[PDB]
Amino acid sequence: TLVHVASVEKGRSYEDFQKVYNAIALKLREDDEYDNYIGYGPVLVRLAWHISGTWDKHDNTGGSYGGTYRFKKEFNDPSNAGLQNGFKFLEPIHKEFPWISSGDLFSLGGVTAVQEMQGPKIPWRCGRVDTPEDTTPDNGRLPDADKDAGYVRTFFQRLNMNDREVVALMGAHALGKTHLKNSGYEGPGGAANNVFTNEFYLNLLNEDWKLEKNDANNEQWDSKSGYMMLPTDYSLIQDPKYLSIVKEYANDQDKFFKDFSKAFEKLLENGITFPKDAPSPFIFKTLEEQGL
Ligand code: HEM
């Protein structure tokens, strides 16, 4: 069995990590022009997810622990096209705080982004430890977007996620947009794409979606409002079990926030064993809460 035990960066405590959070948050505020004024929040959330979503529950390969996205096999995964922008954003942060591990930095970037975009608090734990280049997972473990609900359910079971966790996590697609050159899909999902809300679910249910091909010859669902849904997004209103949960979150943002926060922490921690004397999870203050 392959076990990864969280090991706190030597001598570091909550306050040290809050300083890293603050540096990420200050740079997020500064770099507001990125991606036609969306800012870096969405791509940092996607980075935190993609470095975690290589995990395989069966043998504990992949996952956030090892920080392996720093190695070219993983950095160059076609599934990760565009994430280099997030890595480049985090580079000056890592320079300022060289003591933090890569997996801790990448995952903390996603937590910081969600919170600074007015999302829920996401508890976060330190202690991911960089592992060598030969531990980098092969490409092909991240999901395809052209597929249906059965594919989504099966995929997420590899990450030990159930229906509620899947539907909650997908709500992150309120953020950012698809970019044709990255993924072969184009467009935002709504008007509020750098503030964290339940808009994904509302737009899934309330827009009039039309199936179209895009300029890369791929099918996607488009609305007159200029929004889009991936086939895997749209699958959440095709499957009866997913549809029930989509309606729940469309009706109740507080419940979505609570479930997202739990699922996202779980995603970022998959594969990691936290020893009993490990610090409790940290809840970082936003810049606003600190007067910064
Ligand atoms: C079935 C699972 C999923 C599929 C197929 C999928 C697919 C995609 C695709 C194709 C894009 C567009 C990339 C680009 O063109 O730049 C995207 C963007 C994004 N994904 Fe997902 N995704 C999935 C799950 C998730 C999850 C679980 C999260 C996080 C909780 C997430 C967060 C995001 C974010 C924030 C963006 C916007 C990035 C940006 O604007 O640069 N995705 N996803």
From Swiss-Prot:
> What does the UniProt record tell us about how this protein is modified after translation?
CCP1 precursor is processed by the rhomboid protease PCP1, which cleaves the N-terminal hydrophobic transit peptide. The m-AAA protease (composed of YTA12/RCA1 and YTA10/AFG3) is required for CCP1 maturation: m-AAA protease promotes membrane dislocation of the CCP1 transmembrane segment within the transit peptide to ensure the correct positioning of CCP1 within the membrane bilayer, allowing intramembrane cleavage by PCP1.
Q: Give the cofactor note.
A: Binds 1 heme b (iron(II)-protoporphyrin IX) group per subunit.
**GO CC terms for this protein?**
mitochondrial intermembrane space; mitochondrial matrix; mitochondrion
| GO biological process assignments | cellular response to oxidative stress; hydrogen peroxide catabolic process; response to reactive oxygen species
The entry's active site is 50, 189
Recorded GO terms, molecular function?
cytochrome-c peroxidase activity; heme binding; metal ion binding; peroxidase activity
Subcellular location per the Swiss-Prot or TrEMBL entry: Mitochondrion matrix; Mitochondrion intermembrane space
User: Which residues are annotated as site, described as Transition state stabilizer?
Assistant: 46
For the ligand (heme b), the binding residues are: 173
- Is Endoplasmic reticulum among this UniProt entry's keywords? no
Record keywords, A-Z: Heme, Hydrogen peroxide, Iron, Metal-binding, Mitochondrion, Organic radical, Oxidoreductase, Peroxidase, Phosphoprotein, Transit peptide
Chain segments annotated as coiled-coil in the UniProt record: none
Q: Which cofactor does it need?
A: heme b
Q: Where's it mainly located?
A: mitochondrion
EC number(s) on record? 1.11.1.5
Catalysed reactions, semicolon-separated:
2 Fe(II)-[cytochrome c] + H2O2 + 2 H(+) = 2 Fe(III)-[cytochrome c] + 2 H2O
Q: Which family does the record assign?
A: Belongs to the peroxidase family. Cytochrome c peroxidase subfamily.
Note from the entry: Present with 6730 molecules/cell in log phase SD medium.
Tell me how this protein assembles: Forms a one-to-one complex with cytochrome c.
Q: What does this protein do?
A: Destroys radicals which are normally produced within the cells and which are toxic to biological systems.
User: Under what name is this protein listed?
Assistant: Cytochrome c peroxidase, mitochondrial
What gene is this protein translated from? CCP1
